[PDB]
Each structure stands twice: as C-alpha cells, then as structure tokens.
Amino acid sequence: SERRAVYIGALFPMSGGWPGGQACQPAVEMALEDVNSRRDILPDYELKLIHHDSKCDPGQATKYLYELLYNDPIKIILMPGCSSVSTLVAEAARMWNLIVLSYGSSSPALSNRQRFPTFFRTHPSATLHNPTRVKLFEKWGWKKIATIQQTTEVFTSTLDDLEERVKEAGIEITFRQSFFSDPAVPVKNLKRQDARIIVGLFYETEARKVFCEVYKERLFGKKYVWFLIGWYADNWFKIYDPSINCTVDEMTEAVEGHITTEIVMLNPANTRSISNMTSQEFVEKLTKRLKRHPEETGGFQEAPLAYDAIWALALALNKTSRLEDFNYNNQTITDQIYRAMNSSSFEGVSGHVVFDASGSRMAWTLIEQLQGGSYKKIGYYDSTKDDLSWSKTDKWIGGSPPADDYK
Amino acid sequence: SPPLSIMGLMPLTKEVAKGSIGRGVLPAVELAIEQIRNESLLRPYFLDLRLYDTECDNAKGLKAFYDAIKYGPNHLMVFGGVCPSVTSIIAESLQGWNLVQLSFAATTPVLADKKKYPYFFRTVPSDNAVNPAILKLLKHYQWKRVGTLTQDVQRFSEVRNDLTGVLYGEDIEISDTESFSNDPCTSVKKLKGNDVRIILGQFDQNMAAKVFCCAYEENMYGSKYQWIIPGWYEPSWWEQSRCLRKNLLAAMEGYIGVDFEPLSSKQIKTISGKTPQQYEREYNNKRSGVGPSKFHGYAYDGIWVIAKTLQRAMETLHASIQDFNYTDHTLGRIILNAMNETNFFGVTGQVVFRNGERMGTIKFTQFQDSREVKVGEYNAVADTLEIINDTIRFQGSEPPKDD
Ligand SMILES: *[C@@H]1O[C@H](CO[C@@H]2O[C@@H](C)[C@@H](O)[C@@H](O)[C@@H]2O)[C@@H](O[C@@H]2O[C@H](CO)[C@@H](O[C@@H]3O[C@H](CO)[C@@H](O)[C@H](O[C@@H]4O[C@H](CO)[C@@H](O)[C@H](O)[C@@H]4O)[C@@H]3O)[C@H](O)[C@H]2NC(C)=O)[C@H](O)[C@H]1NC(C)=O
Ligand SMILES: *[C@@H]1O[C@H](CO[C@@H]2O[C@@H](C)[C@@H](O)[C@@H](O)[C@@H]2O)[C@@H](O[C@@H]2O[C@H](CO)[C@@H](O)[C@H](O)[C@H]2NC(C)=O)[C@H](O)[C@H]1NC(C)=O
Ligand SMILES: *[C@@H]1O[C@H](CO)[C@@H](O)[C@H](O)[C@H]1NC(C)=O
Numbered sequence: 181s182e183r184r185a186v187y188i189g190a191l192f193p194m195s196g197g198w199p200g201g202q203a204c205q206p207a208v209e210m211a212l213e214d215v216n217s218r219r220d221i222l223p224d225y226e227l228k229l230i231h232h233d234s235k236c237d238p239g240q241a242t243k244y245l246y247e248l249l250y251n252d253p254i255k256i257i258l259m260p261g262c263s264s265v266s267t268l269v270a271e272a273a274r275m276w277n278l279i280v281l282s283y284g285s286s287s288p289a290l291s292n293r294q295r296f297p298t299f300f301r302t303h304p305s306a307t308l309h310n311p312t313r314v315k316l317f318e319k320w321g322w323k324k325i326a327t328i329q330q331t332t333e334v335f336t337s338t339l340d341d342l343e344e345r346v347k348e349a350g351i352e353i354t355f356r357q358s359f360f361s362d363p364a365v366p367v368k369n370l371k372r373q374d375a376r377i378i379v380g381l382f383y384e385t386e387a388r389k390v391f392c393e394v395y396k397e398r399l400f401g402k403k404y405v406w407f408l409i410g411w412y413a414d415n416w417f418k419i420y421d422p423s424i425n426c427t428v429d430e431m432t433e434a435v436e437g438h439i440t441t442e443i444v445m446l447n448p449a450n451t452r453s454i455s456n457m458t459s460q461e462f463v464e465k466l467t468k469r470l471k472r473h474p475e476e477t478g479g480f481q482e483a484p485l486a487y488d489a490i491w492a493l494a495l496a497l498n499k500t501s502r503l504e505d506f507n508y509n510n511q512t513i514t515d516q517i518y519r520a521m522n523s524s525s526f527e528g529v530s531g532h533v534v535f536d537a538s539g540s541r542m543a544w545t546l547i548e549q550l551q552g553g554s555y556k557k558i559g560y561y562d563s564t565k566d567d568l569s570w571s572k573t574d575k576w577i578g579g580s581p582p583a584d585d586y587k
Numbered sequence: 588s589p590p591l592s593i594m595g596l597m598p599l600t601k602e603v604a605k606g607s608i609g610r611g612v613l614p615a616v617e618l619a620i621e622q623i624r625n626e627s628l629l630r631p632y633f634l635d636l637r638l639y640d641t642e643c644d645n646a647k648g649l650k651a652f653y654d655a656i657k658y659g660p661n662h663l664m665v666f667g668g669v670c671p672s673v674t675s676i677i678a679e680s681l682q683g684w685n686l687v688q689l690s691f692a693a694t695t696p697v698l699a700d701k702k703k704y705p706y707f708f709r710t711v712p713s714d715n716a717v718n719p720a721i722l723k724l725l726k727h728y729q730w731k732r733v734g735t736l737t738q739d740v741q742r743f744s745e746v747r748n749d750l751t752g753v754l755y756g757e758d759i760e761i762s763d764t765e766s767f768s769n770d771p772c773t774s775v776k777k778l779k780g781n782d783v784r785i786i787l788g789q790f791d792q793n794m795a796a797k798v799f800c801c802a803y804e805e806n807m808y809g810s811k812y813q814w815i816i817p818g819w820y821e822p823s824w825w826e827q828s829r830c831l832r833k834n835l836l837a838a839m840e841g842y843i844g845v846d847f848e849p850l851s852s853k854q855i856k857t858i859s860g861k862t863p864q865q866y867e868r869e870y871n872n873k874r875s876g877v878g879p880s881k882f883h884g885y886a887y888d889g890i891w892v893i894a895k896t897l898q899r900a901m902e903t904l905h906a907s908i909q910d911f912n913y914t915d916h917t918l919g920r921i922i923l924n925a926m927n928e929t930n931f932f933g934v935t936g937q938v939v940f941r942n943g944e945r946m947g948t949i950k951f952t953q954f955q956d957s958r959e960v961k962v963g964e965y966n967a968v969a970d971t972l973e974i975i976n977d978t979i980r981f982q983g984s985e986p987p988k989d990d
C-alpha cells in the first residue's frame with residue numbers, strides 16, 4: 181500500500197504587527213519531517229503543508245484563505261498565526277467544516293466557542309496571567325487591587341477576566357483606570373486614591389511613559405507593588421525615548437521591585453518530549469534552519485508552540501486514523517478530529533500540551549521580580565494542578581511584602 | 588450585448604432581519620437598471636448585476652463573496668454591503684481582487700479609513716456625518732457650551748469620539764462628557780449638576796425613553812433646555828418604567844433629531860430626467876407589497892454611480908474591458924479613479940465623494956406634540972445650514988442660552 185497525502189492550509193505572518201512566521205514556518209517544517217519519519221504516528225498518512233504569507237493582516241489573509249479553500253488539494257485543517265488573522269479564519273471555518281489550530285494567537289476573545297466552534301491554539305490566551313496573579317495576591321494576603329490599562333482590546337478583555345477571577349478568590353478591584361496614549365491622569369488618580377497593589381497592562385512605549393509618571397508621583401517604594409507582563413525588551417526602562425522627561429537612574433528607581441508574569445513557551449526542564457528532543461536541542465536545531473540570528477528572527481520564542489501544534493494535530497489524526505474522504509460539506513470527520521483535539525495530552529518542546537473547554541492552551545507561567553535593575557526568577561505557577569514552585573529569591577524593603585492599605 | 592458584471596452583496600432572506608434593507612431597495616435598483624438599459628447608456632455593453640445573499644453573517648457573507656468569485660462571472664465591481672462586520676471583512680480584502688466597492692447602506696464610520704479600506708466607496712453619509720451638521724446648528728443658535736450623553740456601545744462612542752475633532756478649533760466648549768451602559772439617570776443628574784443646557788445625545792431608541800424619563804425627573808426640559816439626539820428612531824418609538832407617558836412627552840417636547848436625508852427636497856430634474864418626487868412615486872408603484880426602505884434612493888443613485896463610473900472607465904480605455912479577471916491592477920485603478928470623479932445630481936441630492944465618503948444632506952427634525960417634524964437641512968458640499976421658517980419652535984421667547 182501507499183501513504184495518502186493529508187494537507188494543512190497554513191498562514192505565516194512574515195511581516196506585520198507580529199512577524200511570527202519567520203521562525204514558526206521552519207519549526208512547522210521540522211515538526212512535519214519528525215512526524216512523517218516516525219512510523220508509529222501516521223504510518224498510513226503523509227502530512228503535507230500548503231502555506232501563504234498573511235503579513236499579519238486580515239484583509240491580506242482573506243485573499244489567501246480563498247486560495248487555500250477554493251484550490252485543490254482539499255485541506256483538512258487551517259493553521260493561522262496572528263490573533264487578527266485567527267479571528268477571521270476561525271469564524272469563517274464553520275462554512276467549510278474545518279478545524280482551526282493557531283500557533284501564535286493570544287487574544288482572550290478567541291476563547292469563545294459560539295463565534296469559534298472548531299478553534300484550538302497551542303499559544304495560551306492572555307488570560308493565563310490572571311490565575312498566577314490571583315495566586316500571588318492570595319499568597320501575599322492582598323484583597324484590594326488597583327488596575328491600570330492602556331486602551332487596546334487585548335488589555336480590556338484581560339482585565340474583564342481578572343474581575344471574575346478575583347471575585348471567586350474573595351478579592352476585589354478597588355479602582356480601574358485607562359489611557360489611550362498619555363498615562364499622566366490615571367497614575368495621578370492611583371496616588372490620590374492611595375492604591376498599593378497595582379496591575380498595569382500596556383506595551384513597551386506606554387510602559388516607559390507609565391513609569392516616568394510613576395517616578396514623578398513617588399508611586400514606587402515600600403508601599404507599592406506593580407504587576408506587569410514580562411514581555412518587555414531586556415533593559416526597557418533604560419531605553420532612550422525623547423517623549424519622556426525622566427532619567428535612566430530615576431527610572432531604574434521607579435521600576436525597582438516590580439513583579440512580572442510571562443507565559444512559559446519552552447520547557448525550562450532538561451526532559452525529553454515526544455519528538456525525543458530536549459528544549460535546548462530544539463533551539464539548536466531551529467537556529468540551523470534560520471538564515472538570520474534568532475534575535476533578528478520574528479516568533480523565535482513562539483516557535484516551540486508551532487512545533488507542538490503539528491504534534492497536537494498529528495496525534496489527534498492518529499487517534500481518529502478515512503482522512504482522504506474529508507469534504508468541506510461534511511461534519512463527520514471534523515467532529516471526530518475535534519473530539520481527538522479536545523482530548524489532547526502530551527509532552528511537547530513548550531511543555532505539557534492540554535486545551536481547556538474553549539480550545540485554549542494551558543501552560544506554566546514564569547514569575548519574576550526586578551532586583552537591582554535585573555529580573556530574577558522567583559517561581560513558576562501551574563493553573564491546572566494549582567502548584568506553585570517557590571524559589572525563595574523574592575525581596576522586599578520591609579523584609580516582607582507590604583499591604584494593600586493604610587496600616 | 589457583452590455584460591458588465593457587478594457583484595451584488597446584500598442580505599435578502601426573510602429569515603434575516605436586515606433582509607428588509609436588501610429587498611426594500613431592489614425595486615429602486617430594478618428602476619435604475621431598466622432605464623440605463625433602455626437609454627443604452629452603456630452601449631455596446633449592458634449592466635449585469637448578479638445578486639448574492641450575505642445573510643448578515645460574517646461566515647455566510649464571506650462564503651457568499653468567495654462563491655461569487657469562484658462560480659460567478661467576472662465582476663468589475665462590488666455593489667452593496669449592508670451589515671457593518673460583514674462589509675468590513677469584504678471591504679478590507681477588496682485590493683486582493685482589484686474590486687472597487689460601492690455601498691448604499693453601510694453607515695459605520697470605521698469604513699472612512701482609506702489605509703484599511705482604499706477600494707471602498709458609499710453613497711450614504713456615515714453615522715459621523717451628523718457632526719458637521721450639529722456644529723452648524725450650534726453656530727446658528729449661538730450655542731458655545733455643550734454637554735454630551737453617550738451610551739457605552741461602539742456605534743455611539745464612535746460618533747462622540749468624532750465630535751471632539753469637529754468641535755476642535757471652533758469656539759465650542761464640551762463642559763461635561765457623560766457616559767452610561769444600562770441606566771442614564773446618574774449621568775443625567777451630573778449634567779443637571781454641572782448646569783448643562785444644550786445636550787448632544789448618542790444612544791439607541793430603548794435608552795432614549797429612559798434618558799427622557801430621567802430628564803423629566805431632573806427637570807432637564809422646557810424653555811431652558813435643548814436636546815440634540817439621533818433622528819433615525821422608529822416613529823411612535825416612545826409608545827412601544829417609573830415615568831408616565833404624559834411626563835415622557837413633556838420632557839421629549841422640542842428635541843432636535845439628526846439623521847441623513849433619504850431623498851432630495853429640491854423639485855429639480857436629476858440625471859435620469861425625473862425629479863426626486865417623480866422617482867419616489869415610480870419606486871412606490873414598483874415596490875408593490877415589499878415594505879419601503881430609507882436607503883432606496885441611495886441604492887438608486889448607487890446604480891447611476893456605477894453606470895457613470897463604467898462610462899468614464901470605457902473612455903479611459905478608448906483614450907488609449909472584457910478580460911477583467913481580478914488580476915488586472917490597472918483597470919481596478921482606472922475604475923477607482925473614475926469613481927473619484929463622480930459629480931451629478933441624484934435623487935438623494937448632489938452625488939459627490941470626498942475620500943470614498945459621501946458629501947450629502949443631513950435632516951434636522953423637531954419633536955412637536957405627537958411626532959418628529961422636519962425643521963431644516965444641512966448641505967455637506969457647501970457646508971451650509973437652512974432652517975425652515977415657521978417650523979422650529981422654543982418654549983421661551985428666545986431659544987435657550989448655553990449657561
Ligand atoms: C532519545 O534521545 C537520545 C538521543 O541521543 C543523541 O541525541 C540526538 C539529538 C542525536 O545527536 C543522536 O545522534 C544522539 O545519539 C537516545 O539515547 C541514545 O540511544 C542510543 C541507543 O541506545 C545509545 O547508544 C547505545 O550506546 C550503547 C553503549 O552505551 C551501545 O551498546 C549501543 O550500540 C548498539 O549495539 C550494537 C553492537 O552490536 C550496535 O551494532 C548497534 O548500532 C546498537 O545501537 C548504542 O550505540 C546512546 O548512548 C543513547 N544516548 C544517550 C545520551 O542516552 C535515545 O535512545 C532516544 N530515544 C528514542 C530514539 O526513542
Ligand atoms: C480625486 O478627486 C479629487 C476631487 O476632484 C474634484 O471634485 C470631483 C467631485 C470632480 O468634480 C473632479 O473633476 C474635481 O477635480 C481630486 O482632487 C482635485 O484634483 C484637482 C487636480 O486635477 C485639483 O484642481 C483640486 O483642487 C483637487 N480637489 C481637492 C479637494 O484637493 C483628486 O486629485 C482625485 N484623485 C485622483 C484622481 O487620484
Ligand atoms: C498512534 O496510534 C497507534 C494505534 O492507534 C498507537 O499504538 C500509537 O502509540 C500512536 N502513536 C503515538 C505516537 O501515540
């Protein structure tokens with residue numbers, strides 16, 4: 181007998197807001213070679229890739245989604261990268277009875293089963309920071325939290341989720357402030373309302389502006405703890421920006437002691453996953469395929485999720501095991517792949533891969549603290565098993581964390 | 588005759604509520620197509636409008652568009668797009684198939700972004716087009732201080748956000764900006780507290796009855812107050828909890844409604860040789876049992892925009908069409924440049940575009956005893972206001988003062 185070719189219709193953003201496809205396409209190519217060379221996964225089938233550059237643009241992606249659906253061969257799954265591209269393809273997909281599997285989407289809105297009934301993602305939702313936040317609050321005894329956000333759909337949704345999460349844990353949000361571009365008025369209000377435990381969600385440019393305003397208002401020190409997303413560049417507060425008044429020294433001062441949460445994208449452990457690679461081996465392997473240095477390559481940190489997306493699909497198809505009879509007008513095979521994808525449980529290069537009811541990836545979070553102008557690993561949190569690994573590396577001026585109020 | 592194919596994208600099914608817009612405009616579309624064919628305006632060619640049901644759904648609407656490109660003839664342009672989310676998806680992708688689009692019913696301001704939607708055009712003024720009209724009304728009555736009441740829904744916040752830019756560099760102060768999601772009463776008390784006299788309201792029909800209920804309770808009505816709110820509500824919308832009906836009508840008394848003008852009031856012959864009044868009679872006879880749609884004139888003028896566009900494009904090619912696959916960038920640019928030249932008097936008044944946006948007519952109404960009565964019109968082209976003498980009224984000897 182001969183192996184039947186089975187096709188993935190993928191979209192890789194080689195440019196745009198998140199040029200993740202630069203490192204994610206070779207990671208997908210490596211994963212397909214690895215799955216196809218294994219005779220114990222799909223011995224009867226050969227997984228093949230048909231792809232296009234979406235440019236992280238929905239309008240641009242609409243042209244390629246047509247190209248994938250209206251040209252032979254029939255695709256069994258759709259694989260988009262960007263959140264904006266995934267929102268378009270995952271909503272449209274039901275009309276062609278297609279499973280959608282994203283390797284790079286973080287938008288909380290994508291975890292809606294009514295709008296996106298066949299959607300899965302190896303990239304966790306931005307809401308994954310919230311159970312780690314509630315756990316750090318509980319450990320430190322805080323029940324009063326202030327929130328500050330830049331106005332972006334992603335941050336609004338993340339804070340909306342934090343609200344329902346704090347309520348269950350018996351914690352309340354004291355004050356919520358927002359800003360489009362200038363954070364002068366929201367930070368002044370945080371001092372006025374005597375906020376102590378503050379969650380700040382914004383991009384790098386806005387973070388520098390928030391922290392300049394934070395210095396000028398003495399909103400840093402023993403009384404205050406800031407919670408930020410650990411996605412900034414290496415010495416972000418030191419980066420020169422002519423739009424900000426504050427100096428490097430004044431600003432290294434304002435950021436001192438703040439806590440960050442970051443989604444774990446590469447298993448810190450030296451264990452071997454299903455491919456039998458180590459986290460470190462995968463990195464060495466991917467760096468070789470790349471024309472440019474990892475630092476220059478977009479989506480290098482997200483590349484393990486793209487590698488794991490291929491394995492998640494391969495294992496789901498192996499459960500169902502037929503595939504060549506797939507048609508866009510039939511729910512039968514789709515519902516079976518769906519059930520197999522929903523039941524995913526395996527070790528990947530990014531760690532243990534499992535999806536929640538919404539189809540969103542469950543993963544570890546890396547907790548860090550800025551100690552002397554440098555981030556220090558203070559622990560990890562697993563939302564599913566409720567287990568916190570504590571390093572005993574965290575430090576406070578009081579010798580103990582402050583408190584949410586006046587006392 | 589060779590066909591000039593056009594992709595008609597609109598909700599048509601009775602199952603979808605917005606299907607009434609699509610069906611309500613079809614007799615008007617039929618009238619324009621019939622005349623253009625009779626006059627042989629497009630000679631040697633003929634306008635071939637193919638209709639595809641979008642069902643007012645993102646997935647169904649996208650598949651309807653995709654199926655039209657795959658199985659349909661080679662369309663030169665897109666006609667339609669009613670529902671905001673579906674129209675945005677199609678409008679953003681247009682360049683991929685070098686297709687110029689002309690909508691007659693999509694009013695969402697988002698579509699004015701030519702970085703995101705360069706190939707999109709519309710004959711209907713957007714929800715923001717009421718703002719340059721309101722400014723003219725404020726200037727006319729010497730209202731230099733205003734307060735705003737906005738429902739926290741995208742559609743309304745878009746309008747309020749645009750108002751900031753329109754009133755900037757103008758001698759008008761927004762002394763109080765108030766928002767609400769479910770109940771306006773708290774925001775209405777704050778407006779009263781800050782002594783707001785002229786209120787610019789942006790909220791739905793359901794919220795409007797609540798706004799006027801709070802207004803009666805807080806005495807924010809009569810000779811001292813002027814409410815300027817949306818003019819697109821259903822007639823007898825107020826009839827459809829704490830306040831009485833007589834008390835709602837007392838607070839509603841004298842409100843100014845603002846919306847686009849469905850048809851020109853000028854008894855002047857249009858491009859078709861008919862006055863807007865003559866076309867309206869022709870439309871009412873033709874529609875038969877199908878319920879009327881306020882976008883009918885915009886759909887009628889839309890067909891004329893396409894026909895006049897195809898004429899200019901045909902001349903440009905002759906100055907130097909059948910093989911237009913969606914691959915011809917040059918023809919798409921020719922059609923795009925030809926549509927930018929649109930300048931004729933239609934049933935909705937003068938049909939002219941300013942960066943894909945319609946420069947049209949805005950209707951001013953006033954609630955008087957039992958219903959909304961027309962009190963004026965704003966001309967966007969000339970940026971002029973005409974207030975109908977002996978219609979608009981104030982409870983006091985003078986129109987209210989702003990403080
Ligand atoms: C999973 O992971 C490791 C991968 O090993 C290494 O990393 C890769 C990235 C790549 O660099 C690769 O080349 C490299 O090996 C595997 O662990 C290795 O497994 C092999 C097989 O057991 C081990 O080699 C054996 O070594 C013993 C001596 O220790 C030999 O007795 C034996 O040799 C054999 O014996 C007969 C003699 O007649 C020979 O003729 C046969 O060829 C036969 O192989 C092997 O040579 C090797 O030492 C292991 N390394 C480590 C570090 O443990 C592991 O097996 C992989 N799992 C899989 C593939 O399921
Ligand atoms: C797009 O059209 C604008 C406006 O065109 C004018 O108004 C139309 C309604 C129609 O009557 C046209 O004949 C008019 O020219 C163009 O901008 C105009 O360009 C001419 C230069 O030829 C200049 O005299 C005018 O000042 C311009 N008007 C404005 C408001 O700037 C514009 O060039 C066209 N763009 C194209 C074709 O790419
Ligand atoms: C693939 O399926 C077979 C039988 O259904 C099973 O034995 C095998 O372990 C599966 N492969 C993997 C890698 O799980």
Ligand SMILES: CCOC(OCC)P(=O)(O)CCCN
Pocket residue numbers: 197198200261262263264284285286287303334482
């Ligand atoms: C331009 C930024 O886009 C991202 O966030 C959008 C909500 P994304 O979710 O599309 C990619 C994130 C990769 N970790």
